[PDB]
Ligand binder design. Sequence first.
Ligand SMILES: NC(=O)[C@H]1CCC(=O)N(Cc2ccc3cc[nH]c3c2)C1
Ligand SMILES: NC(=O)[C@H]1CCC(=O)N(Cc2ccc3cc[nH]c3c2)C1
Ligand SMILES: [Zn+2]
Length: 139
Amino acid sequence: SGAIYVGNYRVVNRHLATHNDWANLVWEDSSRDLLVSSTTAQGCDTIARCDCQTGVYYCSSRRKHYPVSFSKPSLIFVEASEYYPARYQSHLMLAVGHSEPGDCGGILRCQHGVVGIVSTGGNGLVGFADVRDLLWLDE
Ligand SMILES: NC(=O)[C@H]1CCC(=O)N(Cc2ccc3cc[nH]c3c2)C1
Ligand SMILES: NC(=O)[C@H]1CCC(=O)N(Cc2ccc3cc[nH]c3c2)C1
Ligand SMILES: [Zn+2]
């Protein structure tokens, strides 16, 4: 679990969105595993606007933060799960690191701010849904 709170927006993994997220829906993209909902209270998380390929992510299944080198956002095949059939997930970045399904929502940050959230993993990999291209989150 986990979310990004920026301005009047809440960014979550689409597969973990709640009834309240869907009732206040702003945008969603199944191919990216992202959903953004509106909030009444202002958030002050900062989104990175950069091309960093290193950062640190929070891993809830270890209660620890880990440094990572990750790939640029790209279209990657993701095997079927109980939430999606087998498909290409877009805007996904991979890195070597520990992740389990419940780690989804952990934030990846660089020195500029929030880069994305954990969305995939397995066998010593961790995949993050990028949010740096969503410029409208800042307005
Ligand atoms: N026309 C309708 O039936 C909609 C209109 C807008 C609307 O908020 N709902 C209720 C609702 C809310 C969240 C969720 C998640 C899943 N289903 C939901 C249903 C019903
Ligand atoms: N973005 C997706 O399509 C997700 C949807 C929810 C989901 O359970 N998965 C499989 C998955 C996710 C993380 C991990 C870490 C280790 N094994 C994992 C297996 C894929
Ligand atoms: Zn950066």
